Amino acid sequence: AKAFRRYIFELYFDPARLLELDDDQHLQRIERFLDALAPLHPVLENWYLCGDSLRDALSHNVTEHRQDLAKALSRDRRTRAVELVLWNGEEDPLKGGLSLDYEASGRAVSSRLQLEDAGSLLQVFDAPASSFVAIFLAVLEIWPETTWGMLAPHAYFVHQRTFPDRRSIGWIGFCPHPLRATDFPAATELVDIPGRGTLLLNGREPMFERVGEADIKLMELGYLPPLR
Contact 61, 48 (CB under 8 A): yes
d(CA 104, CA 81): 6
* 114 Cβ contact list (under 8 Å, min separation 6): 8, 9, 10, 11, 100, 101, 102
Going from the C-alpha of 53 to that of each of 50, 57, 59, 73, 76, the distances in angstroms are 9, 6, 10, 20, 18
Contact 122, 130 (CB under 8 A): no
| Header resolution in angstroms | 1.6
Fill in the amino acid letter for 122: L
What technique solved it? X-ray
**What secondary structure letter does DSSP report for 154?**
H
Q: What is the DSSP string of 169-202?
A: -BSEEEESS---GGGS-TTEEEEEETTTEEEEEE
- Chain centroid to CA 100: 9
Our CA angle for 58, 60, 61, nearest 5°, is: 90
- Chain centroid to CA 85: 14
Contact 170, 158 (CB under 8 A): no
Query: Residue 25 in 3-state DSSP?
Result: helix
Fill in the amino acid letter for 181: A
- Cβ-based burial of 34 (10 A; exposed 0-12, middle 13-18, buried ≥19): buried
* 117 Cβ contact list (under 8 Å, min separation 6): 5, 6, 7, 93, 98, 154
Query: Which residues, listed in sequence order, are joined to residue 43 by a DSSP beta bridge?
Result: none
d(CA 130, CA 155): 23
